[PDB]
C-alpha cells in the first residue's frame, strides 16, 4: 500500500507515502506530471500533487486527497488531457467505467457508466409464439411467456462467443452467427418444449457474420466480416456503394465498415460508422445513397407505413428520411425541437421498434430510459466529455422508471417486454452514530 | 504516573450488595422431605424437589410438621436465589406451604427476618413485570402484523454430433 518516488539518475528513494491499505495495482499521471494518481485494491483513488511552485522547486510530492468511487477492485486507471478533454477513467471488478477530471479530481463531478449498454442486442423476442431468446458465451436460452417457462436451451461447441442470433418470424428457424462460422438450427415445438435440429448448409458454416436478418421465414441477409452483403434462401450478392477514403478512415479502419443492417419488407438499409446511410433493394440488389451524417449512427429503423427511415446519431438527434424532400416534414420541424428529456439524456438511444396499434407511433429506448413519439404531431416550439470543437471525422411518452434495460420490444399490440438485469467487497466502514 | 492524569476508577475486590439485604438487621415423599430439611442434605432434598406433580406437592406439605415448614420456606428462597430459572416450579411449593400452614405462620414472633429472602426474591420478579408487558406489547404488534402478512430441456451439440 506504499507509493514511492525514486530519483532516476541516482536510483534512490526520494519520498515514501503509506496511502493505501492494500495492494496498489495501477498508477497514472497527467500530461505535465503535476499529478500522480494511484488506485488499487482498497477501492480508493489517491491524488498526489506537485503543482505548487515551491513543491516544484523542492521536488516534493504531496498526497492532496483521496476519493471512494468504486465498490470493488480498481484494476485499471488511465488519463487523457487535451485542450477540450480532461478524463481520468478507472475500471475494475465493479464492471463499470468511472470518469473524472484530472484538474478537478478533488472537487469535480463524476459519472458512473452503466454496467451494460446494449449497443448490440444479446436478447431478442418473437411476437409469434411468444419466445424470448438470449445468447451469452456460446449458450442460447429461449423462454416462452403465456408465467414464463424456459422451453429450451442450446449449447454450442465453438469457443468463440456468439456475435448475433436471428430468429425467423415464424420462429421455426433460428440462425446463430459467429465470426468464424454461421450455424442455422430449426426449432420445432413438442410437449411445451422445442426440438432442435441443425440444418446443414456449407456456405453459412464457412461464412463470417457480423449481422444477420430474416427477409421472411426462408430468406436471410448476411453481412460478412469483409462487408459483403448477400442473400441466402436456406449467395446472391448485393451491390454496395464505394466509400471515399479519408484520413480518419485510414487512422481508424472500422468506421467505414457496416454497423447496422436492417431489412424491412424487401427493403434493406446499411449504416456505417462514418455516417453514410444507403437504401438497398434486395430484389433489385442495387444500392442508392440516402444520407451522409456527421455523427456516429446509433440506431436505424424503417417504417413502411410512412415510407421513411429513422436514423439516430450519437448526439441523440432524430432524422426521418423519405425513401425515393429528402427529409420528412416532421424531421424538418422537430429534429432541433426535441423535448428537454431527449436532449438532456447523456445515454444514447440503441433500440427502435414500431407500435402495432398505430404505425405512426414509434418506440425508442436506451440502457435506462424508454420513450415513445408520434410522428404525426409536431412538438411545441416555445463536463465529462469532449467539447467537440473539432469535427467528428477529420403523443410523447417518456419513462426512466425501468432500468437497467437489456432489451425492450412488444409481444402484442398491448403487451410490452422489458428485460432488466437483476463478488465480495473490501470493507470500508461507514461511520454511523 | 503523570500528575496531570486523573486517577481511573477501579472496583477491585469490593463487595457489591443491594438495599434489600436484610441479613444483619400414597406417592408422597414427606418423610424424605422432613428428613432432608432436618439434616440439611442438599442431595436428598433435591430429589424431593424434582417432583412436578401438583397433587404430590399438596399431599406432601399437607402432612409436613408445621415447624419444619418454616425452614422449608427459607431454603426454597435460597435455591430460587441461586437459580432463577427454577422460579416457576418452586413458587408452587411456596404456595401450598403458605395456605396449609398459614395458621401456624400467623403464630410466629417474626416473619420478615426469617423470610426476608423470599420477600427480596419475590420482589425482584415483580420489578420485571412492568417492563416485560411493554416488551410483550411491542412483541405483540409485530407478529400480529406479520402473521396477517435444466438438463431435461438441454440440447448438447457434441452429443448430437456423436449420436
Amino acid at each position: 500500500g506504499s507509493i514511492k518516488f525514486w530519483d532516476f539518475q541516482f536510483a534512490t528513494l526520494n519520498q515514501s507515502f503509506k496511502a493505501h491499505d492494500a495492494d496498489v495495482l495501477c498508477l497514472t499521471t497527467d500530461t505535465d506530471n503535476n499529478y500522480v494518481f494511484s488506485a488499487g485494491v482498497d477501492r480508493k483513488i489517491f491524488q498526489f500533487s506537485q503543482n505548487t511552485n515551491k513543491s516544484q522547486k523542492n521536488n516534493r510530492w504531496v498526497n492532496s486527497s483521496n476519493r471512494l468511487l468504486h465498490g470493488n477492485d480498481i484494476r485499471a486507471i488511465c488519463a487523457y488531457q487535451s485542450k477540450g478533454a480532461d478524463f481520468l477513467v478507472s475500471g475494475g471488478v465493479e464492471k463499470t467505467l468511472v470518469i473524472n477530471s484530472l484538474t478537478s479530481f478533488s472537487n469535480g463531478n463524476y459519472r458512473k457508466m452503466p454496467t451494460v449498454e446494449p449497443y448490440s442486442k444479446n436478447v431478442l423476442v418473437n411476437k409469434e409464439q411468444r419466445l424470448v431468446v438470449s445468447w451469452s458465451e456460446s449458450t442460447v436460452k429461449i423462454w416462452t411467456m403465456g408465467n414464463y417457462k424456459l422451453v429450451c436451451k442450446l449449447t454450442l461447441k465453438d469457443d468463440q462467443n456468439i456475435s448475433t442470433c436471428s430468429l425467423s418470424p415464424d420462429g421455426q428457424v433460428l440462425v446463430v452467427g459467429r465470426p468464424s462460422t454461421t450455424k442455422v438450427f430449426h426449432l420445432q415445438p413438442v410437449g411445451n418444449k422445442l426440438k432442435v435440429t441443425k440444418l446443414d448448409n456449407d456456405l453459412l458454416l464457412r461464412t463470417s457474420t457480423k449481422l444477420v436478418k430474416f427477409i421472411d421465414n426462408s430468406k436471410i441477409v448476411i453481412c460478412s466480416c469483409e462487408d459483403d452483403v448477400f442473400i441466402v434462401d436456406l449467395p446472391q450478392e448485393v451491390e454496395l456503394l464505394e466509400v471515399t477514403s479519408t484520413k480518419s478512415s485510414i487512422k481508424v479502419p472500422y468506421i467505414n465498415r457496416i454497423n447496422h443492417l436492417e431489412v424491412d419488407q424487401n427493403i434493406a438499409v446499411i449504416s456505417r460508422g462514418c455516417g453514410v446511410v444507403d437504401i438497398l433493394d434486395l430484389k433489385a440488389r442495387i444500392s442508392k445513397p440516402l444520407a451522409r451524417l456527421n455523427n456516429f449512427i446509433t440506431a436505424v429503423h424503417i417504417n413502411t407505413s410512412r415510407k421513411s427511415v429513422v436514423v439516430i446519431t450519437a448526439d441523440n438527434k432524430i432524422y426521418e428520411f423519405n425513401m425515393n424532400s429528402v427529409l420528412t416534414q416532421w424531421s424538418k420541424n422537430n429534429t432541433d425541437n426535441l423535448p428537454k428529456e431527449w436532449k438532456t439524456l447523456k445515454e444514447n438511444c440503441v433500440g427502435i421498434f414500431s407500435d402495432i396499434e398505430n404505425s405512426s407511433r414509434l418506440w425508442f429506448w436506451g440502457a435506462t430510459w424508454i420513450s415513445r413519439i408520434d410522428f404525426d404531431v409536431d412538438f411545441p416550439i416555445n463536463g465529462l466529455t469532449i467539447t467537440d470543437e473539432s469535427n467528428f471525422m477529420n403523443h410523447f411518452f417518456f419513462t426512466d422508471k425501468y432500468k437497467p434495460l437489456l432489451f425492450v420490444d412488444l409481444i402484442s399490440s398491448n403487451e410490452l417486454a422489458i428485460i432488466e438485469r437483476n463478488q465480495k467487497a473490501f470493507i470500508q466502514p461507514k461511520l454511523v452514530f | 504516573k503523570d500528575l496531570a492524569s486523573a486517577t481511573n476508577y477501579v472496583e477491585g475486590n469490593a463487595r457489591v450488595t443491594s438495599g434489600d439485604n436484610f441479613k444483619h438487621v400414597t406417592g408422597t415423599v414427606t418423610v424424605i422431605l422432613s428428613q432432608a430439611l432436618q439434616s440439611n442434605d442438599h442431595s436428598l432434598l433435591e430429589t424431593v424437589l424434582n417432583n412436578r406433580d401438583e397433587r404430590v406437592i399438596r399431599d406432601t406439605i399437607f402432612r409436613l410438621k408445621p415447624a419444619l415448614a418454616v425452614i422449608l420456606l427459607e431454603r426454597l428462597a435460597e435455591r430460587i436465589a441461586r437459580q432463577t430459572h427454577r422460579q416457576g416450579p418452586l413458587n408452587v411449593w411456596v404456595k401450598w406451604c403458605l395456605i396449609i400452614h398459614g395458621g401456624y405462620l400467623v403464630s410466629i414472633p417474626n416473619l420478615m427476618s426469617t423470610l426476608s429472602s423470599l420477600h427480596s426474591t419475590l420482589k425482584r420478579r415483580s420489578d420485571l413485570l412492568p417492563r416485560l408487558l411493554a416488551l410483550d406489547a411491542r412483541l405483540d404488534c409485530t407478529i400480529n402484523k406479520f402473521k396477517t402478512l435444466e438438463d431435461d430441456v438441454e440440447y448438447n451439440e457434441e452429443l448430437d454430433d456423436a449420436g
Binding site: Y148, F397, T399, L416, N422 | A137, R138, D140
Partner: peptide, 29 residues
C-alpha cells in the same frame, strides 16, 4: 373482572407507545 380490565389497559397503553423475478404491471400513456 378488574384484573382483565387492567391487563387489557396495559396492552393498549404500551401499544400506543410503539424484488420479484417476474412482475406484471400496466404502463400509463
Amino acid at each position: 373482572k378488574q384484573v382483565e380490565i387492567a391487563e387489557r389497559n396495559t396492552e393498549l397503553w404500551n401499544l400506543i407507545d410503539t424484488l420479484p423475478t417476474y412482475t406484471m404491471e400496466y404502463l400509463d400513456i
